[PDB]
Design a protein around this nucleic acid. Structure first.
Ligand code: MG
Ligand code: MG
Lengths: 257, 255
DNA sequence: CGTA
């Protein structure tokens, strides 16, 4: 019947761990948990963090130490786990997990931040290209798909507090926002906007200006589903009172047979 | 050529676990000035109080494990004063005023205002009491060296993140203006008369590689009265010494 | 991400 999925950029898993991540996790009780920015060598993580009771866990670390990484905890045996799009440039930064849960594929993606370089804005845009290709291929083969994670782009003006101030800042460039339009036009739905059309709804806030108190944030974290599957979506929400990282978690609930 | 070193040590027992004792003989100043001793000096090692070649002087706070200043000297002063004659300022282990005849040395751990409005207010009034003190000594004709942790970076050049910190104590317009007012009473920031570059810092946050990335503040200073500035040979930041969140700073004077 |  009901399956709950949570996505969370954790800005460091052992950092969030010292702040009581496990207490939060055991309280929230997702059936599947997607995490971005683990940043730790998974094989030397606390055992109580790798083996949480009732879950199987999967870590996909970057090649660079202390950088990126994603993880998934699941109560549902996956029938398959893939950790890349099959393009080495993109598959080495610890950004990709694709799990087969029979009814749907689950993509847990840490999409690149394009602020550091002109070439990281390029890397980002090309990761975007490669992701759309991958998901489209799986979808066109008859698979339902759920994509969650940190897209690193606010879509519409509704999705950041200062839209006009950032129109030349990565995360809100016309190029970036245009790809999300294109992504959607390929048959995918922004699930939060299926149920909530309000401004103010953010998932990231700068640590400075102490922006979170002020609610001066960006919606950088999304659950997307393919159109064909959108009737199984019952809930899509932001867990805005969950602290510990510069991102808050997002939740999805699907009703399934 | 007399060399003075000023170092906020974030605890004298914590830094003792690094070979501060080995640094201190591996780098032998005429006068060593230490801020934030954080310890009952009678429960400090015999070898930590009584160093060979040095008379040591500890000015501890009333509060346990808090604040405190120390001075190690080859030539002992003729007097040591430990307060401005203002009670709430004189009980926090913040003040050493040593008469070396040829000059007075102020070894001051200035309050930090970051924790509350009351402590910011306290830091600012401490700023006033000190200025009155040093103005009075300077007016009696004395040559004055003032060293230690001011807990304020004066100008944007003196910290890595001026913009996000302009509402943080350590970089308020009220704190920066007092450094203006102090200098304009006829006192000289010694470092800035030899080095005018950015990225010159004495403190770095422990949190987030800060030092290894050089995100720091210049919070430690050597100041002299205007008249006396002619005798300052060198003023430098000992950027590479470790074991505290502050690094040492150095002064070489001629006579 | 470094200001605690
Ligand atoms: Mg991050
Ligand atoms: Mg300290």
């Amino acid at each position: 019947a009901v399956l709950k999925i949570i996505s969370w950029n954790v800005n460091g898993l052992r950092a969030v761990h010292r702040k009581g991540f496990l207490k939060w996790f055991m309280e929230e009780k997702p059936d599947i948990l997607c995490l971005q920015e683990i940043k730790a060598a998974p094989e030397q993580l606390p055992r109580k963090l790798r083996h949480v009771e009732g879950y199987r866990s999967f870590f996909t670390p970057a090649e660079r130490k202390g950088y990126s990484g994603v993880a998934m905890y699941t109560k549902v045996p996956p029938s398959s786990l893939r950790e890349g799009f099959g393009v080495e440039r993109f598959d080495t930064e610890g950004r990709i997990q694709i799990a087969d849960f029979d009814d749907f594929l689950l993509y847990n993606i840490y999409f690149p931040n394009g602020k550091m370089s002109e070439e990281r804005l390029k890397y980002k845009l090309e990761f975007y290209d490669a992701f759309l290709e991958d998901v489209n291929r799986e979808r066109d083969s008859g698979r339902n798909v759920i994509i969650c994670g940190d897209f690193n782009t606010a879509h519409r003006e509704i999705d950041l507090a200062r839209p006009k101030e950032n129109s030349n800042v990565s995360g809100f460039l016309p190029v970036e926002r245009a790809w999300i339009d294109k992504f959607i036009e390929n048959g995918y739905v922004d699930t939060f906007r299926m149920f909530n059309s309000d401004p103010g709804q953010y998932t990231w806030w700068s640590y400075r200006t102490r922006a979170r108190e002020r609610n001066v944030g960006w919606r950088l974290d999304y659950f997307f589903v393919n159109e064909e599957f959108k009737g199984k979506v019952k809930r899509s929400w932001i867990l805005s009172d969950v602290m510990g990282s510069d991102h808050c978690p997002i939740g999805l609930e699907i009703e399934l047979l």
